[PDB]
Amino acid sequence: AQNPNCNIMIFHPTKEEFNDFDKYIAYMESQGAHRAGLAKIIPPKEWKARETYDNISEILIATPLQQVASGRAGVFTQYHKKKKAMTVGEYRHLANSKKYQTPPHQNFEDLERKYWKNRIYNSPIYGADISGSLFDENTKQWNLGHLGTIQDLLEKECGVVIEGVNTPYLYFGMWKTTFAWHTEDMDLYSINYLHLGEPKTWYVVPPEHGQRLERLARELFPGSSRGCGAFLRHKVALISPTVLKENGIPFNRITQEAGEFMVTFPYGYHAGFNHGFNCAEAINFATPRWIDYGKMASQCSCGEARVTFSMDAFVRILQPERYDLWKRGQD
Ligand SMILES: O=C(O)CNC(=O)C(=O)O
């Protein structure tokens, strides 16, 4: 068995290997990359996402979210308070202001220590889930707006034609902006490209050990667990690496820098934080190996998780027994 310790693997495809996206994901899995839940892909030196980032300031962040924490430093939840619209240029200036800017630090490990010590005492503002793309239309390799759609994959594997679309999303971050512990909708893959700015640190639990994380989360968040049998779908709970180590939960960590791709694999729980002003683009995708994970994915039916139009068909076709309860949660 390849990668039996479930380490995060880093890949350096050549320009030739960067042509066929599906083929390279299958290659990475042949080497055991999915066992970690997360992989890093460094593009060949010949590749670029677009020519420059000099003209992005007029993009609108219609609903910036202030991420307010409750709990203790290593075990907390966050809620998202809606703020007034602002442009990317306005948001960048805010991220760089004395109130929000990255503190002085020695290296990524010192910054990580400062994040876990001090995150809860601040409320950073995140531009999340903005439909759109920063890939040039002429970029033909690993262009996250030109991937094969999940609806086409389901149709190719299973024969059923379904409604829905699959488009990318932009994220504008600042110091301490935080992504809570989660797997993707329907335990899909994700791919994330860091277009510009400061790094993103990731934490990940191997898919084979995801239920260990869920059992810890039920212990640590006992009211939330009573409320919903899949409350991590709400995307609000944080648990630090120190707490994970104290409870014996297997995990790994890695820092993504600008110009790098990360892939999350089906049922790989992940969480993390941004180091400073940055912009990422991400989208979900599927492969044949996903189908069995989609059929088994948990679902939130309490009303909190509320998701895209296109998840309807995935539930309806892969999980018909759960469909009526889940749809009631959507309504
Ligand atoms: O970058 C972020 O805030 C969160 N991204 C992801 O969870 C992802 O790409 O799957």
Ligand SMILES: [Mg+2]
């Ligand atoms: Mg612009």
Ligand code: NI
């Ligand atoms: Ni994710």
Ligand SMILES: [Zn+2]
């Ligand atoms: Zn729920």
